[PDB]
Amino acid sequence: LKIRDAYTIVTCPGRNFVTLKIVTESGTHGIGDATLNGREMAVAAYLDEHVVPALIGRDAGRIEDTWQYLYRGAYWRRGPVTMTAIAAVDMALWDIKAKAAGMPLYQLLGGKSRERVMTYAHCTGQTIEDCLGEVARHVELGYRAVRVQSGVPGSTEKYLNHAPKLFAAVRERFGDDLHVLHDVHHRLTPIEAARLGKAVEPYHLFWLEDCVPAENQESLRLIREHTTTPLAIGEVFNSIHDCRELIQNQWIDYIRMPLTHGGGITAMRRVADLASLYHVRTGFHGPTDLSPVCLGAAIHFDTWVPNFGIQEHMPHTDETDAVFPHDYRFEDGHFLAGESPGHGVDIDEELAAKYPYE
Amino acid sequence: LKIRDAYTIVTCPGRNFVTLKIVTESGTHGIGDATLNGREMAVAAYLDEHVVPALIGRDAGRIEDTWQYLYRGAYWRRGPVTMTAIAAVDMALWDIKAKAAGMPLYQLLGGKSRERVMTYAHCTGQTIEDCLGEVARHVELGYRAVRVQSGVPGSTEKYLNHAPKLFAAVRERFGDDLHVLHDVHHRLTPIEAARLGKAVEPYHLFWLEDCVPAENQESLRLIREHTTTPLAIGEVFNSIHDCRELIQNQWIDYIRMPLTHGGGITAMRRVADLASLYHVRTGFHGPTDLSPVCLGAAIHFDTWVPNFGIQEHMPHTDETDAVFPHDYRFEDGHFLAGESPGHGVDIDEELAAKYPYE
């Protein structure tokens, strides 16, 4: 089944989303998320002006080959723009393949490893008290895990002294069963993150993510050597080469690279495999700037992957969900993979047209 | 589609072969090679007496889960018997899945990466001259690569001195285009293999395999540090853990672990992924004691895998091919993957019955 047509679709049902659609001569089509928040048009042009023309005429069943083919075109380079475009193509081809196989994507990957995928919600507030309120309502919704953030009265020093109080407060009010995560937004140096890790050890965090800027993977060594608080990193990584050392040296517990920014299903399957050799688990970055297409594919991946950790959940706007109909569902804090052939997500082009890029 | 029945089949159309067959309630079935040369009955009993009973009632689409499930039963242990049984189950389930998907196995894995898979033939003789004869006829058959072995007039010392003469002779008579491989059958110590590697450098071997006993992976260090002759190892490995260090330290160029002895498609997919991170390529062990079932699955794997190296070919007897009908074909020195749903191989139970275990 050759590729007869392929094109990008830019819509803004709440926020900008770029989608790639590929249609085979047999009529079957597939879509993949190509949204790169804050630089959306760079990817759109990349696909339109360079990738799409090359897709025409190619055999859509050659997923691996197309991935390698496009990777070569980028001159073997890893980059946010480069890998998002490739991931979009990869997601579309896997969509087409699963449909062609008449099975939901997770079946194509190796089958179900779990019935549902645990998620975590964002609980932020200006004060520790506000935050505790959010945690309260989210645990009501059934979430078994929450990411907690709050404002710091008054600076690195103030943050380091305040952070522990927040976690102490959450534990006093909610107990030890709840999984609590925290993002440090890479504001720290390795030794400062080490200090933070040690200070929050009594609160047993699920993870402490994005502790320090990690372009230099060795940055995590000092943290790992000084604390037993679990570490997560990589929401912004684009290649397995951005985390190969982190994983092989066992400096992290969760890899956060998401499908769209990490080259797609093909590439992340390999990162997950490498991670499993070292006890590292998946912890897919799941912000709103990652369309329901990515989310659906992510849920399928999460359903199959043996070393599954947790899935981030930042609910999309109703308009976004309308434009991107899907069969994955959220229930009692967990996601359930769809059972429809393909990744179970589609795009309503007409409705999408009613929401122009902004 | 639940597993309604599963059983082993032992036949001897030339040599002993153990096959596992799994049948789903929907009628669809799949088979996997479980032949462990010289200890065939150990695996047969393993499957019959312990694995089969546990397969009944399980969902055959859960390949990953079944793999992990059986791995746990073995108490997380890697072993020739243990992994062959698991590989048989894994091959059968992948067979069922591809059929269910209505596509040949290579399509299910990610599509075609190459049109045909290069092979190499065994060219042995009592004398260098006999060997050259075999090479002559095999290159006539279209083979682009050959493994050369010959008797040693007269001992490690005699072998070390004779080996270079054999390669010099093959190069003088056939030129530099031909790929020539050599198996040292682990008769050497690391420093002796290093010496051999250096001595044959002028003959540019495709590879020198099984240089030394490698249970201790560090055994390859000395060889790699003293020669630029390509190294291949692992025809007898059962786990990714038997070669993780060899690969990450770049001490080898080709991994030889085959599907049946290496836990199947599921497991070897991961080993191939790890290998690609370090320029290591696949070089599947393909003796006759590995049934056409394994060969068919191997050809599909070889067709997709990006870091494909070469496929070993030791033709089966006509009786073996009769008992195991298949759609893969050999042409001009290369294999062509079948296009039939599943891995394209089946077993004629009636005919198989006419050849009892020996």
Swiss-Prot record, chains A, B:
Catalytic center residues: 185 (proton donor/acceptor)
Cofactor(s) in the UniProt record: Mg(2+)
Keyword Coiled coil in record: no
Residues the record lists as binding Mg(2+): 183, 209, 235
InterPro entries in the cross-refs: D-mannonate_dehydratase-like (IPR034589), D-mannonate_dehydratase_GalD (IPR053379), DgoD-like (IPR034593), Enolase-like_C_sf (IPR036849), Enolase-like_N (IPR029017), Enolase_C-like (IPR029065), Mandel_Rmase/mucon_lact_enz_CS (IPR018110), Mandelate_racemase_C (IPR013342)
Enzyme's top EC category: lyase
Classification via Gene3D superfamilies: Enolase-like C-terminal domain, Enolase-like, N-terminal domain
EC number from the UniProt entry: 4.2.1.-, 4.2.1.39, 4.2.1.8
Protein name: D-galactonate dehydratase family member ManD
Taxonomic source organism: Chromohalobacter salexigens (strain ATCC BAA-138 / DSM 3043 / CIP 106854 / NCIMB 13768 / 1H11)
Upper classification of the organism: Bacteria, Pseudomonadati, Pseudomonadota, Gammaproteobacteria, Oceanospirillales
Gene: manD
